[PDB]
Amino acid sequence: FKTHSYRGVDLEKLLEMSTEDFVKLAPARVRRRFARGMTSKPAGFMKKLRAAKLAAPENEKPAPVRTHMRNMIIVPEMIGSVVGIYNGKAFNQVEIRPEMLGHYLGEFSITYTPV
RNA sequence: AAUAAGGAUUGACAGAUUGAGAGCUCUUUCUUGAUUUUGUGGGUGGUGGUGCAUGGCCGUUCUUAGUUGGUGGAGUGAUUU
């Protein structure tokens, strides 16, 4: 068997890392997202991601958060977190990952039905 | 009018919860300070309806040739040229 090494760059540091770090390693868009309208995104999610990941027993998933920030990023410290999102009415949750990392949040939440 | 400075209430760490560094909740029990909270009375959020409740504008008869009135004059008069 051969684990998702995020850009092996050698999970190991893509498990539990800074916000300077992967600020750089995203694909062009995001440079112009951590650095633009930077403040006031997680005025209190990375501070309810850290109340969740953190009030569990771990391994029992944690007690669901709330959020309408479908405009946040997927970063290497929210790895596991649980997360639950406004499509305009209700909180659709999601498994949060190492291979969701660099990608858009609430792309994921699917809003509109299709057929 | 009721809670009643003996706290109306507010806020939060982080962790449980989730997209999440929303104290959304619950764990704690710090903070909080008459500005809130609760019902009663009522408002003002409304790209929710009704274009046939309507305003204003803009399409159409319209790169149209067409209206209307006095004084005469005509013709109960609806009037007429």
Residues 6 or more apart from A84 whose CB is under 8 A from it?
A64, A65, A66, A67, A91, A92, A93, A94
Give the phi and the psi of residue A100 in degrees, each rounded to 5: -85, -5
The total of other beta-carbon atoms located within 10 Å of residue A115's CB is 2
| Token pair belonging to A111 | 């809003």
Way the structure was solved: cryo-EM
CA distance A29 to A22: 13
Resolution in A: 3.7
Give the bases of strand B that a protein CB approaches within 7 Å: 12-27
- Encoded amino acid at A102, one letter: G
Residue whose C-alpha is closest to residue A67's, from A99, A47, A93:
A93
Question: How many angstroms separate the CA of A12 from the C1' of B37?
Answer: 52
Q: Measuring from the CA of residue A96 to each C1' atom, give the nucleotide at the shortest distance.
A: B19
Which nt has its C1' nearest the CA of A100? B19
CA A43 – CA A92 distance, rounded (Å): 22
Query: For chain A, what is the HEC assignment?
Result: CCCCCCCCCCCCCCCCCCCCCCCCCCCCCCCCCCCCCCCCCCCCCCCCCCCCCCCCCCCCCCCCCCCCCCCCCCCCCCCCCCCCCECCCCECCCCCCCCCCCCCCCCCCCCCCCC
- Beta partners for residue A86, in sequence order: A91
Across all strands, nucleotide nearest A78 (CA–C1'): B20
